[PDB]
Ligand binder design. Structure first.
Ligand SMILES: *[C@@H]1O[C@H](CO)[C@@H](O[C@@H]2O[C@H](CO)[C@@H](O[C@@H]3O[C@H](CO[C@H]4O[C@H](CO[C@H]5O[C@H](CO)[C@@H](O)[C@H](O)[C@@H]5O[C@H]5O[C@H](CO)[C@@H](O)[C@H](O)[C@@H]5O)[C@@H](O)[C@H](O[C@H]5O[C@H](CO)[C@@H](O)[C@H](O)[C@@H]5O)[C@@H]4O)[C@@H](O)[C@H](O[C@H]4O[C@H](CO)[C@@H](O)[C@H](O)[C@@H]4O[C@H]4O[C@H](CO)[C@@H](O)[C@H](O)[C@@H]4O)[C@@H]3O)[C@H](O)[C@H]2NC(C)=O)[C@H](O)[C@H]1NC(C)=O
Ligand SMILES: *[C@@H]1O[C@H](CO)[C@@H](O[C@@H]2O[C@H](CO)[C@@H](O[C@@H]3O[C@H](CO[C@H]4O[C@H](CO[C@H]5O[C@H](CO)[C@@H](O)[C@H](O)[C@@H]5O[C@H]5O[C@H](CO)[C@@H](O)[C@H](O)[C@@H]5O)[C@@H](O)[C@H](O[C@H]5O[C@H](CO)[C@@H](O)[C@H](O)[C@@H]5O)[C@@H]4O)[C@@H](O)[C@H](O[C@H]4O[C@H](CO)[C@@H](O)[C@H](O)[C@@H]4O)[C@@H]3O)[C@H](O)[C@H]2NC(C)=O)[C@H](O)[C@H]1NC(C)=O
Ligand SMILES: *[C@@H]1O[C@H](CO)[C@@H](O[C@@H]2O[C@H](CO)[C@@H](O)[C@H](O)[C@H]2NC(C)=O)[C@H](O)[C@H]1NC(C)=O
Ligand SMILES: *[C@@H]1O[C@H](CO)[C@@H](O[C@@H]2O[C@H](CO)[C@@H](O)[C@H](O)[C@H]2NC(C)=O)[C@H](O)[C@H]1NC(C)=O
Ligand SMILES: O=C(CN(Cc1cccc(C(=O)O)c1)Cc1cccc(C(=O)O)c1)NO
Ligand SMILES: O=C(CN(Cc1cccc(C(=O)O)c1)Cc1cccc(C(=O)O)c1)NO
Ligand SMILES: *[C@@H]1O[C@H](CO)[C@@H](O)[C@H](O)[C@H]1NC(C)=O
Ligand SMILES: *[C@@H]1O[C@H](CO)[C@@H](O)[C@H](O)[C@H]1NC(C)=O
Ligand SMILES: *[C@@H]1O[C@H](CO)[C@@H](O)[C@H](O)[C@H]1NC(C)=O
Ligand SMILES: *[C@@H]1O[C@H](CO)[C@@H](O)[C@H](O)[C@H]1NC(C)=O
Ligand SMILES: *[C@@H]1O[C@H](CO)[C@@H](O)[C@H](O)[C@H]1NC(C)=O
Ligand SMILES: [Ca+2]
Ligand SMILES: [Ca+2]
Ligand SMILES: [Ca+2]
Ligand SMILES: [Ca+2]
Ligand SMILES: [Cl-]
Ligand SMILES: [Cl-]
Ligand SMILES: [Zn+2]
Ligand SMILES: [Zn+2]
Lengths: 533, 533
């Protein structure tokens, strides 16, 4: 579904302009989409600085883009109303990069049947097919899960689908708008001879005996052990969760059989950063004591320190026992370096130890907060599936809470709530231009194969409610009464998001649910600086 | 371990000359090595035709090459005596393409320990390291399995190893000379922006519900079913063989519940050939009748029949029941086409069906013959581990037999025997310049991830034995008496190969043994046309 012709290729770095017609939330979402390209492709984006051909993103009618580099100078790409979704931006830029819709493939009739009699009159022009002399599928099979594939209802007249998948099980699969599919990357990365990405650094699941090049320190008291189980926990690794026999390993620091203060250090291979900011993430399991801790250091190398200088970046203490726990550690390294995992036994009694698995490192921004939902499957489609996150404080001081609604039969909804907080007396009301990004984590061991489902909203301080109040005003003024889990009363403002965050079927696909656990990643950022672009 | 500098890159297609000093067997092995590059990389090779810089392969002392395009015009690469091994040629050309040995990495001391007290005087320079200002490891961890990594005995004085891997399990792993490692390809394909290969077409294991783009035909009597088990067999697929719970699927044609002559047709996606010759391979399981057959067709597309005209290429009949069977089908397609699998029920009664799994298609030469060894593990290191293949006939008419000796404690040996045959009266004796290629198949589901162990020998008609006879003379004249399994007597000539075909440890690694089955692939080709190159 790629356009044939070297004249349609962009440079690997695309110049762009974010026109002022774009909504605030749209501008932030667009910049997020660029981050995804930087993680999984060799395509990059930079502000236009006089280049002849560039992309002008503006709030036109609908979401659309030309296919390929048209070399017309200013090439328009429309992110109109309701197009402010990261998957939609990725989709539109795949058009710009030279891709038609998946159902436009020359072989599309072998996999889907277009119901022309059920298309709305005047809408049949979007269901075209391109022959193999102008369209090249790059030796990749037809991809129902493509982010460039319409859903079954596209431009439908009535309740009857316009696109019918011959493999009936794919009827509701087509139309996913979560992230690149594996084939989307295969085709794009092939079309642009992509050898590496900007933001990806390392992914380690310990499934090979060389443990991703990590080295055991000799100036310590114990070694991390590559094991597939620990008696007291965990019974299996996090990557496979015991699915495959003889597979599924993790590194374990046995704190039960060492003295207080003893340490085991595991250091990563040498890494060369390109951006100056990184996010280190990994899953931890604690079957020992709450006094045991994991310390993260950064060993930076320079001409001044050829041996490398250590810097403590985070101490992870009081680790919950009995379940895998996701952690994020923010880094700001600019020189070649290693990551250091030091497991230290505390004074408390331990009968197990610390386990680490599914490590990923990328030159990306960490999420500000994480919502970890245990025993999640019971709530899908259940009346008691009305879930509220713990209270969090945004970077600017606003207290907020997340509402995830799984009670309805087909769709899951997610909403961002402001709640009463300790800084409300000194905060700006109504909440102005705070972009809340909510991401349902696709818990694939490899960050490169994650199709996380992400939606963003921006608080508009002029939005009002039916009774005349400002929607994002101080929760004590406009919010309803709510009770914390501990019984403490608080005020919860209006919730804003979408009732169509993710379908229950997609929620049960891939690795959104893993170990009956779900993780929702949260970032609340002031984007008022995007008003002028 | 890659050399830094854009001037050290070759063109993707390297011009080469095979000097007349090269041994006959070496010339054939080199051309075989090129086929591996064409299968797994974007590197190609063409005979030198006046290009300024080209590679001149000649029979120097030992096996060596410069690192990278040195832009000195004629750049020599030595394949001397005993260097005529496909993995050694691949290794030497990885040098030419710009790679140092893996243990020369700047971080090599974190993974291996050099026992300097054990190096031969004057050979310690061979263990030097290149810093990261001239060497780039391309963000790939240290690779013990690299084809560019010395074995533990390199330049050793005595019986004690010079290179000790700090992860002890890799002590005997380093030094593998079977094929590219996965990391070797990751680095090379990254260094030359390889987006695709010349010879790879498709790999299908049916592990995704879209079944690699294969189509179910409507003009037949039944459908192939994507299943993970069949009551009468097989109990699991061939890819995973029940290793992973809920995973491992194959396509099944149920002959038990259809009439005589009924067919189920599965057609592949559209394919575009580049070379004019292809090899289709796949694994079959038969739990039905001995009269059931699998027919392979090719649907070629042309201006004459836009719908496509079918051509029968092979009829697979009398399929042994109760075990997975590997098949190879030779193709000669030059226009865009599909592969067509037609399962046909015979007249016999059936309680099962035909199963197909782990299909691979590449623009490569099929092996002429295959030796399938059942219940293989019992013979490893056993006194009764002296195995003889069935008799085969080479393309020129010579009858031959393969001898695999597993009785030695550490090494497996393989030998090529000429045997008495029905054309011996009219054959040229002594056997002149017939190259026998013996390949222990690494039965990975994906052909692209196979590290098959291959050795080749060429019959020298002047080679003599101690008693004055020609080694490769007519077996009736110079051979010993032997009995086929059915009791029929024949004459077996001398066996030539190596007692160090593969170590037992490597033999038990990866997928050489799969389902307790081993496949040895055989090609005997006249290479007398290579005397003048
Ligand atoms: C115990 O087990 C033992 C081991 O299995 C077993 O021994 C085997 O017994 C069987 C049965 O008796 C023997 O089978 C015979 O094999 C012969 C050899 O076949 C191979 O070689 C053929 C000839 O190749 C030459 O010609 C080709 C082109 O024609 C060239 O491409 C070659 O380069 C080669 O040229 C060279 O040789 C020429 C001299 O012949 C010379 O002029 C020329 O210049 C050059 O030097 C190939 O055609 C043949 O390929 C076919 O068969 C194989 C099967 O293995 C397939 O895989 C191939 O795809 C292809 O189909 C082999 O490579 C055969 O000639 C002989 O065939 C004849 O008979 C059968 C059965 O009736 C017919 O199907 C066939 O058409 C032939 O019929 C012709 O001849 C007969 C008279 O001979 C005649 O009646 C008929 O009308 C017609 O004229 C037969 O298959 C086998 O050889 C034995 N193996 C060994 C190792 O010895 C033993 O019996 C068992 N014991 C018991 C008790 O059961
Ligand atoms: C039942 O459950 C409920 C639900 O949890 C419980 O309710 C909680 O109870 C606890 C304890 O009583 C409360 O803790 C208190 O929290 C407040 C707020 O913390 C957050 O904000 C801090 C201030 O942020 C402002 O300032 C920073 C710079 O200082 C700035 O960067 C920010 O952007 C923000 O700026 C804005 O606000 C300013 C006014 O404050 C303006 O001037 C400015 O212009 C801006 O408008 C912040 O410091 C803090 O960050 C730290 O802590 C978090 C979490 O611990 C951590 O993640 C960070 O890394 C930091 O380490 C938070 O973001 C806090 O101010 C209180 O601390 C003060 O008081 C104590 C006691 O004297 C001192 O020790 C401190 O030093 C400090 O002086 C206190 O921690 C919590 O707020 C409350 N939650 C809710 C939702 O109600 C309830 O208690 C439970 N009931 C029972 C019975 O158990
Ligand atoms: C990906 O790499 C290929 C191979 O180098 C590039 O193809 C070349 O493009 C130039 C510019 O038009 C042509 O003159 C050459 O003939 C092409 N070579 C081949 C073998 O086709 C291609 O341009 C690269 N893609 C991008 C997006 O840069
Ligand atoms: C692989 O592609 C890269 C582009 O990403 C090529 O690197 C460029 O090479 C040209 C010419 O040598 C230089 O002018 C550029 O500065 C390079 N750009 C970058 C980003 O490195 C490289 O030449 C290609 N390699 C091969 C073997 O074709
Ligand atoms: O693919 C697109 C959007 N698509 C139409 C569409 C709209 C809603 C749902 C679906 C679906 O998949 O269910 C598809 C085509 C298009 C082309 C030009 C203009 C507009 C417009 O928005 O007016 C829309 N954009 O690139
Ligand atoms: O790398 C190699 C092989 N050679 C380097 C070499 C080349 C030419 C001459 C000599 C020499 O001094 O005679 C040595 C090192 C080697 C040889 C044998 C076994 C192993 C091993 O891996 O054990 C390593 N060529 O590119
Ligand atoms: C949609 O279908 C209805 C029912 O056939 C018809 O009345 C109407 O005109 C159609 N509208 C369009 C835009 O196709
Ligand atoms: C929620 O409801 C589901 C379905 O009715 C039930 O299985 C589950 O136990 C309930 N959860 C809690 C925490 O009560
Ligand atoms: C090898 O070691 C032996 C044992 O000490 C020594 O006598 C000999 O000189 C050494 N040879 C070389 C070439 O290092
Ligand atoms: C060969 O010997 C091994 C062990 O010595 C034994 O397990 C196997 O069954 C034997 N195979 C035979 C006798 O065919
Ligand atoms: C030697 O090689 C040339 C070149 O291919 C070939 O034509 C010739 O026949 C070969 N010699 C013999 C005896 O086959
Ligand atoms: Ca793991
Ligand atoms: Ca240690
Ligand atoms: Ca399979
Ligand atoms: Ca059918
Ligand atoms: Cl992530
Ligand atoms: Cl193969
Ligand atoms: Zn589109
Ligand atoms: Zn070498």
């Amino acid at each position: 579904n790629s356009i044939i012709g070297e004249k349609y290729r962009w440079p690997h770095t695309i110049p762009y302009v974010l026109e002022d017609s774009l909504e605030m939330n749209a501008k932030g979402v667009i910049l997020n989409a660029f981050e995804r390209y930087r993680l999984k492709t060799c395509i990059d984006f930079k502000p236009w600085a006089g280049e002849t051909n560039y992309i002008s993103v503006f709030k036109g009618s609908g979401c659309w883009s030309s296919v390929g580099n048209r070399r017309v100078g200013k090439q328009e790409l429309s992110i109109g109303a309701n197009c402010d979704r990261i998957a939609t931006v990725q989709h539109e830029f795949l058009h710009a990069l030279g891709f038609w819709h998946e159902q436009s493939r020359s072989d599309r009739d072998d996999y889907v049947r277009i119901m022309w009699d059920r298309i709305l009159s005047g809408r049949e022009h979007n269901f075209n097919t391109y022959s193999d002399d102008i369209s090249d599928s790059l030796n990749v099979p037809y991809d129902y899960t493509s982010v460039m594939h319409y859903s079954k209802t596209a431009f439908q007249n009535g309740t009857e689908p316009t696109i019918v998948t011959r493999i009936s099980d794919f009827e509701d699969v087509i139309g996913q708008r979560m992230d690149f599919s594996d084939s989307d990357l295969l085709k794009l990365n092939q079309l642009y001879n992509c050898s590496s990405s900007l933001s990806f650094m390392d992914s380690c699941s310990f499934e090979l005996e060389n443990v991703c090049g990590m080295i055991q320190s000799s100036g310590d008291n114990a070694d991390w052990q590559r094991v597939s189980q620990v008696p007291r926990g965990p019974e299996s690794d996090h990557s496979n969760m015991g699915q495959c026999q003889g597979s599924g390993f993790f590194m374990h620091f046995d704190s039960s059989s060492v003295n207080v203060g003893a340490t085991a250090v595991l250091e990563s291979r040498t890494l060369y950063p390109k951006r100056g900011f990184q996010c280190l993430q990994f899953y931890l399991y604690n079957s020992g004591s709450e006094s045991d801790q994991l310390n993260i250091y950064i060993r930076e190398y320079s001409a001044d320190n050829v041996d490398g200088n250590l810097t403590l970046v985070e101490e992870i203490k009081e680790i919950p026992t009995g379940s895998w726990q996701l952690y994020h550690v923010t880094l700001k390294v600019t020189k070649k370096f290693r990551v250091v995992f030091e497991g230290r036994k505390g004074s408390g009694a331990s009968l197990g130890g610390l386990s680490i698995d599914d490590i990923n490192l990328s030159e990306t921004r960490c999420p500000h907060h994480i919502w970890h939902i245990r025993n999640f499957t019971q709530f899908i489609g259940s009346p008691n599936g009305t879930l509220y996150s713990p209270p969090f404080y945004s970077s600017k001081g606003y207290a907020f809470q997340i509402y995830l609604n799984l009670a309805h039969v087909t769709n899951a909804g997610i909403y961002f709530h402001l709640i009463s907080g300790a800084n409300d007396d000194q905060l700006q009301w109504p909440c102005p231009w705070q972009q809340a990004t909510m991401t349902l984590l696709d818990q694939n061991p490899d960050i490169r194969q994650r199709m996380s489902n992400q939606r963003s909203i921006t608080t508009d301080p002029f939005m009002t409610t039916d009774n005349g109040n400002y929607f994002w005003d101080r929760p004590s003024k406009v919010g309803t009464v709510a009770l914390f889990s501990n019984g403490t009363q608080f005020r919860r403002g209006g919730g804003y998001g979408t009732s169509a965050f993710i379908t229950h079927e997609r929620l049960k696909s891939r690795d959104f649910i893993k170990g009956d656990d779900v993780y929702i990643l949260l970032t609340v950022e002031d984007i008022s600086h995007l008003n002028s672009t």
